[PDB]
Amino acid sequence: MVLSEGEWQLVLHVWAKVEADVAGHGQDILIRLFKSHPETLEKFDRFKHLKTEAEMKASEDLKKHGVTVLTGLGAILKKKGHHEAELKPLAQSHATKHKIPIKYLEFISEAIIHVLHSRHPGDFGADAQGAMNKALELFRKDIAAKYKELGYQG
Numbered sequence: 001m002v003l004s005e006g007e008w009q010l011v012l013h014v015w016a017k018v019e020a021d022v023a024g025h026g027q028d029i030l031i032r033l034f035k036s037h038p039e040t041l042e043k044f045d046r047f048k049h050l051k052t053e054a055e056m057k058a059s060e061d062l063k064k065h066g067v068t069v070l071t072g073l074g075a076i077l078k079k080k081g082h083h084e085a086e087l088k089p090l091a092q093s094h095a096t097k098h099k100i101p102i103k104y105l106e107f108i109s110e111a112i113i114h115v116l117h118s119r120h121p122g123d124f125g126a127d128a129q130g131a132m133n134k135a136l137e138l139f140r141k142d143i144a145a146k147y148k149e150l151g152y153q154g
């Protein structure tokens with residue numbers, strides 16, 4: 001998997017917009033994820049009992065997690081592929097501590113793309129979506145590699 005410098009800039013350009021409202025993007029992304037694939041919500045003992053979008057939007061725990069996710073992802077994306085240092089801890093943690101299967105990472109990747117398109121339709125077009133798709137695919141591929149190394153078949 002490889003992105004052109006132009007494509008990385010498309011990824012970083014939209015991320016700058018994400019950073020203007022990290023909490024809001026995080027809430028939208030997690031709500032999209034939980035509504036699309038309800039089983040993923042079971043992984044959060046602090047707010048797995050949330051049902052309605054209203055409850056999800058009012059949840060401090062959900063909001064905080066969205067910030068954690070986007071803050072971490074932003075750090076990785078800015079590395080433009082050379083994210084080994086930032087990725088190792090995330091991968092190890094997800095495999096052993098949280099036990100998050102690769103399919104769940106695919107689900108949240110879909111949610112991220114959808115929310116970025118919904119909130120930034122004027123600039124997050126086919127080119128940017130394709131670039132972000134490649135970036136997240138690289139992200140997942142590298143996490144999967146670390147998973148395998150640890151023997152985790154998530």
Ligand SMILES: Cc1cccc(/C=N/c2ccccc2/N=C/c2cccc(C)c2O)c1O
Nearest residue numbers: 040043068069070072073098100104105108
């Ligand atoms: C994609 C991504 C980028 C940067 C950081 C994270 C952090 N994830 C977690 C951090 C602390 C505890 C749990 C985490 N992930 C939980 C999880 C639960 C259900 C589904 C998915 C898919 C998850 O990654 C992250 O999930």
Ligand SMILES: [Mn+3]
Nearest residue numbers: 069094098100
């Ligand atoms: Mn996670």
